[PDB]
């Protein structure tokens, strides 16, 4: 199964994962893919942010799902 | 298109209406990333 990540810059990313993949893994893939800071980028689906550690089945993440990637940003 | 509406449009296609995205953006200072971050943490 593959996922379509959407950056807030207008870039589409197609990643290849399994039914046993995890969020944390997706982030690393994107980092080695383009270079988006892992400590900033965050996975989102249906509005709900995918908590790092859990799998894709815990969020009913279907196939070819439209995932989003938003940075943590700084405002302290 | 207009930036103000452009942000609300992109945000409307994530999981929330244009209304929620509108308030989020404005307050966050019409910032897109901050808006999404609002719907993420801010509640």
From Swiss-Prot, chain A:
Q: Which domain of life is it from?
A: Eukaryota
Q: What is the effect of changing residue 29 to R?
A: Deficiency in ubiquitin-protein conjugate formation
Signal peptide as annotated in the record: none
Q: Where does the record place the Ubiquitin-like domain?
A: 1-76
Locate the cross-link: Glycyl lysine isopeptide (Gly-Lys) (interchain with K-? in acceptor proteins). 76
Q: Where in the cell is it found?
A: Cytoplasm; Nucleus
Q: What role is this protein assigned?
A: Exists either covalently attached to another protein, or free (unanchored). When covalently bound, it is conjugated to target proteins via an isopeptide bond either as a monomer (monoubiquitin), a polymer linked via different Lys residues of the ubiquitin (polyubiquitin chains) or a linear polymer linked via the initiator Met of the ubiquitin (linear polyubiquitin chains).
Task: Please state what the protein is called.
Answer: Ubiquitin
Q: Taxonomic lineage of this organism?
A: Eukaryota, Fungi, Dikarya, Ascomycota, Saccharomycotina
From Swiss-Prot, chain B:
Residue ranges occupied by any UBA domain in the UniProt entry:
1-42
Impact reported for residue 40 to A: Reduced ubiquitin-binding
Modified residues annotated as Phosphoserine in this record:
5
Location in the cell reads:
Cytoplasm
Substitution effect: residue 36 to A: Enhanced ubiquitin-binding
The record lists the effect of residue 14 to A as:
Reduced ubiquitin-binding
Q: When the coding gene is removed by deletion, what phenotypic consequences does the entry describe?
A: Random budding pattern and morphological defects. Defects in fluid-phase endocytosis and defective internalization of the pheromone alpha-factor and uracil permease. Deletion has only a small impact on actin cytoskeleton organization. Deletion shows synthetic growth defects with thermosensitive mutants of PAN1, END3 and RSP5.
Q: Where is the signal peptide?
A: none
Q: What is the effect of changing residue 32 to A?
A: Reduced ubiquitin-binding
Q: What does this chain do? A: Functions at the internalization step of the clathrin-mediated endocytosis (CME) as an early-acting scaffold protein. Requires clathrin adapter proteins, ENT1/2 and YAP1801/2, for normal spatiotemporal dynamics and viability. Binds to biological membranes in a ubiquitin-dependent manner.
Which additional comment does the entry carry? Answer: Present with 1380 molecules/cell in log phase SD medium.
Q: Which family does the similarity line name?
A: Belongs to the VDP/USO1/EDE1 family.
Quaternary state and interactors: Interacts (via UBA domain) with monoubiquitin and ENT1 (via asparagine-proline-phenylalanine tripeptide motif called NPF). Interacts with PAL1 and SYP1.
- Name the record gives this protein: EH domain-containing and endocytosis protein 1
Its gene name is EDE1
């Amino acid at each position: 199964m593959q996922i379509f990540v959407k950056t807030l810059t207008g870039k589409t990313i197609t990643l290849e994962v399994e039914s046993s993949d995890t969020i944390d893994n997706v982030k690393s893939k994107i980092q080695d893919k383009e270079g988006i800071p892992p400590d900033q980028q965050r996975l989102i689906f249906a509005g709900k942010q995918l908590e790092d550690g859990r799998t894709l089945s815990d969020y009913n993440i279907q196939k070819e799902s439209t995932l989003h990637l938003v940075l943590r940003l700084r405002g302290g | 298109t207009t930036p103000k509406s452009l942000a609300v449009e992109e945000l409307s296609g994530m999981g929330f209406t244009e209304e929620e995205a509108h308030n989020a953006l404005e307050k966050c200072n019409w910032d897109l990333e901050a808006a999404t971050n609002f719907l993420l943490d801010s509640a």
